[PDB]
């Protein structure tokens with residue numbers, strides 16, 4: 001009867017895991033499985049990256065959706081055993097899923113949890129909903145942007161509105177790749193998987209979102225103050241200039257990436273418009289950012305301008321950028337699975353097996 | 358299986374005002390002598406039940422967030438609000454209330470006025 005849930009948030013780039021009641025995930029590792037290029041059968045996370053020379057690396061989650069189930073099971077085994085040292089068959093588990101995850105996918109994850117890992121009880125939560133709860137809200141629209149996907153998710157009185165959810169295949173890995181591309185202007189030829197990791201870190205350390213892109217291009221050309229430096233692993237220094245804000249500008253102008261997609265401002269607006277007129281004011285007034293790709297300096301200020309421009313002038317636009325938003329999905333899961341009512345929300349293994357199954 | 362909490366069994370049965378404080382991931386009644394005085398370090402859930410002419414009950418659920426409440430408290434207040442609404446068959450109207458910026462409807466539930474005080478129950482995190 002006395003038992004603490006495990007909380008596992010499954011992302012395209014990283015898994016976040018830990019125990020209900022903690023204020024942050026203690027386990028964060030890359031969502032990567034390596035298997036021998038030619039003869040364990042498999043390696044996960046940080047260790048896989050150190051053996052890239054002899055392993056073929058794969059990402060089992062593509063744009064937020066689990067697409068390689070055998071490798072996903074390896075990720076989950078790593079999570080429970082290597083990272084948490086927990087017996088999954090002895091803890092309830094909260095697992096997260098993407099907005100608009102097909103039910104067939106949810107069922108396979110459930111089958112693996114109950115029949116591979118023998119979990120005694122499980123609850124599946126929608127990632128964006130957990131983020132909204134972590135912000136102390138029951139109504140709002142969450143913009144969740146990670147490594148592989150971005151979603152805009154209107155939520156009313158606790159629940160997502162499925163007909164209004166937008167998916168956008170443009171997120172942090174695209175931005176990393178774009179920075180790799182534009183650094184060729186200054187003579188860098190970053191291209192390997194290891195080099196991509198370095199450029200990801202450059203992006204995180206030096207990039208920012210311009211309040212007005214055209215004006216920022218102008219001002220940055222007038223002096224060298226735009227230039228900022230980063231120490232590479234070999235001790236060499238790289239200097240980056242207007243690439244600092246041109247890189248995340250692709251969130252607003254996907255044409256920079258050769259994509260026809262609408263930018264994140266337009267997508268958020270379109271998502272709100274799908275909702276009936278009578279609830280839009282509460283959505284515009286509660287635009288909540290979630291996920292690592294929302295961490296850029298300047299993002300709230302820029303989104304506020306751009307959504308204000310698109311929206312009716314009677315609306316009151318408020319973009320909320322919680323300081324802990326990077327792992328607000330996981331944090332919302334930790335809160336939910338800690339509640340006195342959580343035991344009434346889950347499905348038990350006996351129920352599943354007799355459903356059946 | 359609709360989610361139930363023992364306090365849910367007491368909720369919205371008669372016209373009146375009911376106030377709970379989030380304490381360590383649970384929903385705990387506020388002592389009635391202390392109604393209207395909110396700790397700035399805490400988060401609360403408030404159900405106002407009104408008797409309608411047609412005979413039915415009207416429900417307004419407000420979750421009030423103090424300026425120093427912890428993230429577990431504000432998150433739990435939001436989630437418990439959803440669960441109580443669901444327990445009331447979805448019939449409640451939900452309202453977020455932030456310290457010092459509360460709606461006139463919420464303020465009006467307290468005759469002698471909405472007040473704040475320093476302190477609060479320890480964070481669950």
Ligand SMILES: Nc1ncnc2c1ncn2[C@@H]1O[C@H](COP(=O)(O)OP(=O)(O)OP(=O)(O)O)[C@@H](O)[C@H]1O
Pocket residue numbers: 010011012013014015063064145146147148149150171172173200203204205290291292293294295296326
């Ligand atoms: N400070 C930062 N600034 C900009 N980008 C960041 C920052 N921190 C992390 N990121 C980016 O966020 C991404 C990881 O975010 P997150 O963990 O939310 O994604 P995920 O859950 O793995 O992926 P998804 O939600 O797309 O399935 C990476 O692209 C990473 O480079």
Ligand SMILES: [Ca+2]
Pocket residue numbers: 010011012127146291329
């Ligand atoms: Ca994610």
Ligand SMILES: [Ca+2]
Pocket residue numbers: 398399400425426427430477478479480
């Ligand atoms: Ca408190």
Ligand SMILES: [Ca+2]
Pocket residue numbers: 157442447448449450451
């Ligand atoms: Ca309702």
